[PDB]
Amino acid sequence: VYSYTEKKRIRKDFGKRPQVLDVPYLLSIQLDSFQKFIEQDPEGQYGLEAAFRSVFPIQSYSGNSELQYVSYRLGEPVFDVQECQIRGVTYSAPLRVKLRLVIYEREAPEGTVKDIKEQEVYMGEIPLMTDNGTFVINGTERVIVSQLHRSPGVFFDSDKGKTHSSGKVLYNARIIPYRGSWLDFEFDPKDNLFVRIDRRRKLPATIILRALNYTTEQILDLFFEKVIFEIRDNKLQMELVPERLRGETASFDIEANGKVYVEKGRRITARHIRQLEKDDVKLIEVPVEYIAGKVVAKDYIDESTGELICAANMELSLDLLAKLSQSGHKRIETLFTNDLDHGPYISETLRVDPTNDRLSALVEIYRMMRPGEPPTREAAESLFENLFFSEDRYDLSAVGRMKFNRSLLREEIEGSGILSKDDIIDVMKKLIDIRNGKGEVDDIDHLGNRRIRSVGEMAENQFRVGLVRVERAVKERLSLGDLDTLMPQDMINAKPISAAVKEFFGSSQLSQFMDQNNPLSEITHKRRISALGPGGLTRERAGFEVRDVHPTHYGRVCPIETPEGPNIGLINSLSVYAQTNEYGFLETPYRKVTDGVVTDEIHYLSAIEEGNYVIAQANSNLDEEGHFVEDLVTCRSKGESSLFSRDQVDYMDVSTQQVVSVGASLIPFLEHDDANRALMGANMQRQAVPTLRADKPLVGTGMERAVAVDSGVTAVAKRGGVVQYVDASRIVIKVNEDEMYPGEAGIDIYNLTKYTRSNQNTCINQMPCVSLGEPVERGDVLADGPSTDLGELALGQNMRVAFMPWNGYNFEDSILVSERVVQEDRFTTIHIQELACVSRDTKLGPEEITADIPNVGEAALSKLDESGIVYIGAEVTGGDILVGKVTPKGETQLTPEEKLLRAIFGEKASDVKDSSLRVPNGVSGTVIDVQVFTRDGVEKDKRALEIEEMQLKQAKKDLSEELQILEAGLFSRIRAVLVAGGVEAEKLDKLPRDRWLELGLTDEEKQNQLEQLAEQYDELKHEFEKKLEAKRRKITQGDDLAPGVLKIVKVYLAVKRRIQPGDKMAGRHGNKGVISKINPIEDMPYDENGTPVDIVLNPLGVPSRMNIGQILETHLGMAAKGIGDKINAMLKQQQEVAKLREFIQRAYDLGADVRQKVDLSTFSDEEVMRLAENLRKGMPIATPVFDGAKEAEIKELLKLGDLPTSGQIRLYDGRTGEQFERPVTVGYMYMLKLNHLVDDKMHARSTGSYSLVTQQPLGGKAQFGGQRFGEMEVWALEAYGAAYTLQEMLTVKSDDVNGRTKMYKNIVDGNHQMEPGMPESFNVLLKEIRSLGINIELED
Amino acid sequence: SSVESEIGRTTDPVRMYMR
Amino acid sequence: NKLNRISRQMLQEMGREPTPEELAERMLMPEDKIRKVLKIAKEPISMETPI
């Protein structure tokens, strides 16, 4: 069963795989994040509560005063969104905190206070988020882009055998915290362990172990295994553990229990080890030579003399063994070291390390961290203890602790955010294990090692920074001065916090203007995963390892949507179904597969857990239960594809389009395109300009309706009902009775947005798409936005294309356009500009907005009213005066000849200088709106008073109308109540409505209905009055402009650019091209019915570029328009409804085993006619991205019309009338119109304004600048013999101050000759060198 | 306390003044 | 400094930024010296600011 917005024009669907998970709300990222930020969180872990609990309470300098936090409350904004955009202010809400101040007493370290005081203190305004995920920061809509940064935790990277001659691999750990110093542990080519805190100078790695209060014996105990020795009256019998015997050759007669097991010279075999274990051998006898290199393990002191025989970690030799023989020691502990399994890394590091105990290690860390100042006993301890183990200056915090515990294979996933001795020891142990051979390194691009920040997290961090600066200020104020029974308002300042948060939201690498020239462009800007920004890798210092597409992007980040150019692969876009874990990592749906059945329960798997399982492919056949119809299914298990069994599978993909993003899932036949061309198409599909009459995609994907509705452009109904009055600017839905709350009398009022400008100067304007008295259900679309159509995203028009070379007018990539495309006004777009004229307060006097401008005639001033401001609706052109403004002038010291001229003609120069705002050259529009802002000390002119009166009348009429609709509904509901339980079929309509609210009722729940409705009516009655007074105050009051500006006038032109050679067009498959001609109608190729083609593309664009998508789209569009033309023919003569039913059913039953049964016998014989009317321009067709419509189905559809199966007809020539040989492809392709308009690119300059220090022209087209004759062009001119052109190109044209004017005079005298001189930039260079000590001069 | 002259291992013309 | 201190104090008395008209009667300046005080330029924005 279909919704009433889908029984109008229902898109034929060609997909075969039944979907099981509907597309999630596309903007969940921004909305969920900022909802987590501004939210009462009782167990404060995220939100403003986390910041307040983290930085509060603030304790004075032992002054027995603490400032402690209680709660907070977001106020409500003074201006809503529309008024914030009109007036030019941020959209924010005042944050108000309840703070409590205590003053303790004496003889009471924790004793009770002597006085408390709680006060609600205002601290800052945080900008709220609109319903669509965009902030309004200064009148404009900003979008904060998510970030993809490396997750906090421990990462055991490697070196991959570089940076050394021998090609050794140098492993190294790193401990990245969320806030605080780094801590590495790198090897060196001698296998000594080294630590470098904060990426500083290197140190031997046992320095930090000694700093953690470990002696040498404890270090050797932690990192090694003791090999005991014994002295059994001779022969040095040694305790044995059988496993350790591997990897060595027997250097002596290995015997025990009176039996020789392995002899000298023979290596130890694994079976020999098994024999030793089986024989149960504990103690053997080894020669004294075996201790020639065995490192001792603990200190030994001769008990006779009390002297240190041998310090720990010192190689035993024959002399030492003889010395400690008679010493009375029979136990000797050594270290078990091998060359492949237990290396002696820590022992060698101890030998290199020049420290001896805790104090010297702390001094060594101090000299490394803070060189120059002399270390002290307490300063070194405080530095080391505040480095890592202090909560004020080190946090991991929670994702960091989870990654840390999991990477060392620990049971728990939550702990202290600061380090500890065991954490550092375990990192060192794991690194040593990785060196030994067991374990693998962590690749730092695995999408399980890269988090995603969002707006909530970044705004929370910035607010925390604001809080800590206020904390320092408070703790300064709390200690000094007095006790004093002050209040916790004078102690706090609200400018630092508001400054910090506003500086984040308004100026950052991640807070950028929302490009707003589509629904698709907005909805793909809000879903961006940037890698740049604060705390992320810069563009210059990112290699090729992170620019690349990883096997973990499958279902999390799109592979074919990334901006080519300087940052390709740093600005990834989120996939369709991809979500965000609790911690921040990305995850994607999968279907749980039981024994053999593909269940339809959905599990989201992050990037790590996806590795363990085996996951089938999206397009795997299954029959009515879920059993895979094959015995082998193409799965992917360990990051690599492979063919597995039917029973080993564990999960199956949830849809065939879950890999590609939302921009690249709107391209039909993507599986036929290339990858570079698909990238270009996905990037050019979001620059399309909303045209005048947005049309439809004739070949779509089914992802259009979701993008249109989920983006905020359209006006989706909230509760179902019946349209009561639809206007060009208002829709009034009357809610169904069952969806109505007991109190209200529901009638929703939707106010449409009419002709406002977007950020890219285009126009956004909603038109209602519902008739009058037409039922609507919940979630229907009531107003097509910019570039949508009945709820389906439509970015451009579909026009009859033909693939043939046409006399060279489509040579390289150009396009030859018919003239019907400009006669029908289908690519004609509307652009809206804003021009401002500020009236400042100069030193010689204020400027004015008068209409009496000096020395200008009368035709220019004919379009200005009495107050010097242009009318509304006045068709201005380039150069006309919009706002007449004159500034005061000095004396100007006029030349003698002009003095004589004035003396002759008696004319007197005026004392004011004309500086009026005038239309920029080139544009020619209609003025649609004028806004006047006046500072609150200036007498408003007549036009500002007229605008105020219009605004006030409009507001009063609006509120009266609101109360009229609502009162009509309220009394309708009251009358409907009066029909049952107190029926008055004729006793009611006679008396006036003012007494309908005061009648009787019976003892039911219906008793408390008339009273409720009456009281709601009274509430609305007073609410109208209060809203009216509020609006009148907000209108009649003055503005608050910049300091020193009296009034601002803003004029909105509405240009309308059509089409011309130069304008860039493109399809969806990345086939761009500049329009090259506008051919007359009678010169285009025509088939045997006389219909010309509208666009003639080039064949040779297809084979070299391999975007075969466009040709299949052309064939399918031809089939769709053939169905449309057949329906139109059946509808032109009024045949019947049965014939229409039969044909449309046959058109909807193609092809081979599709979904979406569309049985038309349930349509009511009148909804068939509306459907046929909406299909008379061509039946829309849906081709899901990788599910596709096969070529055989396109042939069958072409046969269902009458078009030729081959897809190619025979076209005749326009001018000669004789047919082209070799039949050519025609069909309807869907073409966009990118906003690289020619009349924004074209520029020319003869002479304008020159720069300040180096007298050279300025930059392009906004300051009337000249083109840059750079270095490569100078080499090109030197390669010729062109020495005179070069000399004029860098002295007279550009830089030489006298040559410019002399050349201009010589040109206007008809004498082409130059007198070059010397450039001014060279004199600037001479002064800037000579201003060092370097004397440079020009000697002849 | 512990001292090995320290001149000069650092720039920082305020650290020199404090020393 | 006196003007900024009074403006900071009035920011948390009424909850929003205080207008010159109000600052005039919160001090003894005659409502136009406040404008010329507020008009004193801020420190010159450096001519190497990336745009």
Side-chain angles (χ1 to χ4, degrees), chain A residues 201 359 363 367 369-377, chain B residues 1-3 5-7 9-10 12 15 18-19:
Chain A
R201 193 174 55 88
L359 187 56
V363 165
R367 295 187 189 277
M369 290 301 297
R370 298 181 53 81
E373 63 183 0
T376 333
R377 158 74 150 79
Chain B
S1 58
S2 309
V3 53
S5 258
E6 312 311 72
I7 65 208
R9 313 148 127 273
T10 178
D12 225 16
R15 189 169 289 160
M18 292 177 72
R19 176 177 68 207

Coordinates of all heavy atoms in Angstrom, one line a residue, chain A residues 201 359 363 367 369-377, chain B residues 1-7 9-10 12 15 18-19, unseen atoms left out:
Chain A
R201 N 64.8 15.2 23.1 CA 66.0 14.5 23.1 C 65.9 13.1 23.7 O 65.0 12.9 24.6 CB 67.1 15.3 23.8 CG 68.5 14.8 23.6 CD 69.5 15.7 24.2 NE 69.3 15.9 25.6 CZ 69.8 15.2 26.6 NH1 70.5 14.1 26.3 NH2 69.5 15.4 27.9
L359 N 67.2 9.9 42.5 CA 67.4 11.3 42.5 C 68.2 11.7 41.2 O 67.9 12.7 40.6 CB 68.2 11.7 43.7 CG 68.4 13.2 43.8 CD1 67.0 13.9 43.8 CD2 69.1 13.6 45.1
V363 N 66.9 14.1 38.1 CA 67.7 15.2 37.7 C 68.0 15.1 36.2 O 68.0 16.1 35.4 CB 69.0 15.3 38.5 CG1 70.0 16.2 37.8 CG2 68.7 15.9 39.9
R367 N 67.0 17.8 33.4 CA 67.9 18.4 32.4 C 67.4 18.2 31.0 O 67.7 19.0 30.1 CB 69.3 17.9 32.6 CG 70.0 18.3 33.9 CD 71.4 17.8 33.8 NE 72.1 17.9 35.1 CZ 72.6 19.0 35.6 NH1 72.5 20.1 34.9 NH2 73.1 19.1 36.8
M369 N 64.1 18.0 30.1 CA 62.9 18.7 29.9 C 63.1 20.2 29.9 O 62.6 20.9 29.1 CB 61.8 18.3 30.9 CG 61.3 16.9 30.7 SD 60.6 16.7 29.0 CE 59.2 17.8 29.1
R370 N 63.8 20.7 30.9 CA 64.0 22.1 31.2 C 65.5 22.4 31.2 O 66.0 22.6 32.3 CB 63.3 22.6 32.4 CG 61.8 22.4 32.4 CD 61.2 22.8 33.7 NE 61.5 24.2 34.0 CZ 61.0 25.3 33.5 NH1 60.0 25.1 32.6 NH2 61.4 26.5 33.8
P371 N 66.1 22.5 30.1 CA 67.6 22.7 30.1 C 67.9 24.1 30.5 O 67.1 25.0 30.4 CB 68.0 22.5 28.6 CG 66.8 22.9 27.9 CD 65.6 22.4 28.7
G372 N 69.1 24.3 31.0 CA 69.5 25.6 31.5 C 69.3 25.9 33.0 O 70.3 26.3 33.6
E373 N 68.1 25.8 33.5 CA 68.1 26.1 34.9 C 68.6 25.0 35.8 O 68.4 23.8 35.4 CB 66.6 26.5 35.3 CG 65.6 25.4 35.2 CD 64.2 25.8 35.5 OE1 64.1 27.0 35.9 OE2 63.3 25.0 35.5
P374 N 69.2 25.3 36.9 CA 69.8 24.3 37.7 C 68.7 23.4 38.5 O 67.8 24.0 39.1 CB 70.6 25.0 38.8 CG 70.8 26.4 38.2 CD 69.5 26.6 37.4
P375 N 68.8 22.1 38.3 CA 67.8 21.3 39.0 C 67.9 21.4 40.5 O 68.9 21.5 41.1 CB 68.1 19.9 38.5 CG 69.5 19.9 38.2 CD 69.8 21.3 37.6
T376 N 66.7 21.2 41.2 CA 66.7 21.1 42.6 C 66.1 19.8 43.0 O 65.5 19.0 42.2 CB 65.8 22.3 43.1 OG1 65.9 23.4 42.2 CG2 66.4 22.7 44.5
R377 N 66.2 19.5 44.3 CA 65.6 18.2 44.8 C 64.1 18.2 44.6 O 63.6 17.1 44.2 CB 66.0 18.0 46.3 CG 65.2 17.1 47.1 CD 65.4 15.6 46.7 NE 65.2 14.7 47.8 CZ 64.0 14.4 48.2 NH1 62.9 14.8 47.6 NH2 63.8 13.5 49.3
Chain B
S1 N 71.0 23.1 43.9 CA 71.6 21.9 44.4 C 72.6 21.3 43.4 O 73.8 21.7 43.4 CB 70.5 20.8 44.7 OG 69.8 20.5 43.6
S2 N 72.2 20.3 42.6 CA 73.0 19.8 41.5 C 73.3 20.8 40.4 O 72.3 21.4 40.0 CB 72.4 18.5 41.0 OG 72.0 17.6 42.0
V3 N 74.5 21.0 40.0 CA 74.9 22.1 39.1 C 76.1 21.7 38.4 O 77.1 21.1 38.9 CB 75.1 23.4 39.9 CG1 76.0 23.2 41.1 CG2 75.5 24.5 39.0
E4 N 76.2 22.0 37.1 CA 77.3 21.7 36.2 C 77.4 22.9 35.3 O 77.5 22.8 34.1 CB 77.2 20.4 35.4
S5 N 77.4 24.1 36.0 CA 77.4 25.4 35.4 C 76.2 25.9 34.7 O 75.7 27.0 35.0 CB 78.7 25.7 34.6 OG 79.6 26.5 35.4
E6 N 75.8 25.1 33.7 CA 74.6 25.3 32.8 C 74.8 26.3 31.7 O 73.9 26.6 30.9 CB 73.3 25.6 33.5 CG 73.0 24.6 34.6 CD 73.3 23.2 34.1 OE1 74.4 22.8 33.9 OE2 72.3 22.5 33.9
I7 N 76.0 26.9 31.6 CA 76.2 27.9 30.5 C 76.9 27.2 29.4 O 78.0 26.6 29.6 CB 77.0 29.0 31.0 CG1 78.4 28.6 31.4 CG2 76.4 29.6 32.3 CD1 79.0 29.5 32.4
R9 N 73.2 25.9 27.7 CA 72.5 24.9 27.0 C 71.2 25.4 26.5 O 70.5 24.7 25.8 CB 72.2 23.7 27.9 CG 73.5 23.4 28.6 CD 73.1 22.8 30.0 NE 73.7 21.5 30.2 CZ 73.1 20.4 29.9 NH1 71.9 20.4 29.3 NH2 73.7 19.3 30.1
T10 N 70.8 26.6 26.8 CA 69.5 27.1 26.4 C 69.6 28.5 25.9 O 70.5 29.2 26.2 CB 68.7 27.3 27.6 OG1 67.4 27.9 27.3 CG2 69.4 28.3 28.5
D12 N 66.2 31.2 25.5 CA 65.2 31.6 26.5 C 65.7 32.8 27.4 O 66.0 32.6 28.6 CB 64.8 30.5 27.4 CG 63.3 30.4 27.6 OD1 62.6 31.1 26.9 OD2 62.9 29.7 28.5
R15 N 64.7 32.6 31.0 CA 65.3 31.6 31.8 C 66.7 31.9 32.3 O 67.1 31.6 33.4 CB 65.3 30.3 31.1 CG 65.7 29.1 31.9 CD 65.4 27.8 31.2 NE 64.0 27.5 31.0 CZ 63.5 26.7 30.1 NH1 64.3 26.1 29.3 NH2 62.2 26.5 30.0
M18 N 66.3 34.4 35.1 CA 65.9 33.8 36.4 C 67.0 33.0 37.0 O 67.2 33.0 38.2 CB 64.7 32.8 36.1 CG 63.4 33.6 35.8 SD 62.0 32.5 35.4 CE 61.7 31.9 37.1
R19 N 67.8 32.3 36.2 CA 69.0 31.7 36.7 C 70.0 32.6 37.3 O 70.6 32.3 38.3 CB 69.7 30.9 35.5 CG 71.0 30.2 35.9 CD 71.5 29.4 34.7 NE 71.9 30.2 33.6 CZ 71.9 29.8 32.4 NH1 71.5 28.6 32.0 NH2 72.3 30.7 31.4

